[PDB]
Design a protein around this ligand. Structure first.
Ligand code: 9EF
Length: 287
């Protein structure tokens, strides 16, 4: 028994085949998911018909389901974590785990979230390796890209930028020329976690008015503030998260400052495990 945090992945971590043993182990919750969604979560995750997993309207419920079942499996065999943190979409899984809403309610929110984000066009995003936050901001401004945002601050050397599709394409060469060790235009049609998501944020906040949320029973480290979610204004903060940078790196350093000894990724893949290792390594001098 150690102080621990669970970390839940978001968009970009999904894969064809995710969740297989989990669906078999949780037939009853799989059925309830299928009832909220109106289609088979298992078929979506295991057969990826029409590569729907890459389409945000479907990606989001897919991640929610596999994350939530990964959580409940884990909870069969161990005590609950001391802290919770969800990366991007995964913030919904942390809130579920914290009892802010129940399984199916959260699934309903994510379904709506995915439909709203699915209507966004004209946007793009790129992952950049090798440049810190400050250097990224200065290169954006120096290239005239004032309407491009830093969407994810993932680790000391990994950020994700987010803005108009043509602008993200055209920034590649200049970032490469200025030292970006890698620059990859992502297969998204929206500028997620940028100010351009304001329309989605406002509509989402309106949609959330019809829901009631409980204060978290276990602290959830917000993507927006890098600090525990407050016991209220949770609806406001979840809507804001859509259009705000994801302060992941700082969230993780916070949890380490708070005494966390063990960091466990719940959900498909090793995206957050790898980021955690980068963050921890950067704080630890080599021998
Ligand atoms: C969290 C968020 O805003 N999600 C939607 C945007 N992100 C993606 O679509 C995934 C972009 N890819 C990455 O940031 C990196 O490739 C990973 C997944 C962090 C893995 O590291 P790598 O390939 O070095």
């Amino acid at each position: 028994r150690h102080m621990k945090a669970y970390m839940f992945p978001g968009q970009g971590s999904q894969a064809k085949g995710m969740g297989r043993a989990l669906f078999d182990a949780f037939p009853a919750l799989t059925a309830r998911a299928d009832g909220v969604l109106g289609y088979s979560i298992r078929a979506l995750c295991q057969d990826d018909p029409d590569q729907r997993l890459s389409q945000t309207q479907f990606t989001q419920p897919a991640l929610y389901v596999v994350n939530a079942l990964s959580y409940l499996k884990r909870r069969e065999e161990e005590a609950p974590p001391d802290f919770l943190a969800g990366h991007c979409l995964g913030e919904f899984s942390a809130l579920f785990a914290a009892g802010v809403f129940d399984f199916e309610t959260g699934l309903a929110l994510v379904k709506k979230r995915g439909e709203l984000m699915g209507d966004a066009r004209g946007g793009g995003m790129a992952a950049v390796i090798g440049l810190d936050e400050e250097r990224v901001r200065e290169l954006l401004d120096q290239n005239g890209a004032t309407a491009v945002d830093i969407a994810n601050l993932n680790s000391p050397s990994q950020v994700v930028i987010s803005g108009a599709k043509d602008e993200i394409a055209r920034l590649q060469v200049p970032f490469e020329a200025a030292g970006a060790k890698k620059y990859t235009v992502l297969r998204v049609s929206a500028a997620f976690h940028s100010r351009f998501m304001r329309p989605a944020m406002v509509e989402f906040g309106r949609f959330l008015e019809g829901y009631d949320f409980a204060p978290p029973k276990i602290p959830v480290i917000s993507n927006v503030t890098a600090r525990p979610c407050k016991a209220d204004g949770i609806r406001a903060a979840l809507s804001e998260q859509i259009a705000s940078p994801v302060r992941w790196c700082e969230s993780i350093r916070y949890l380490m400052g708070r005494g966390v000894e063990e960091f466990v990724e719940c959900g498909h893949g090793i995206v957050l495990t790898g980021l955690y290792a980068q963050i921890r390594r950067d704080a630890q001098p080599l021998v």
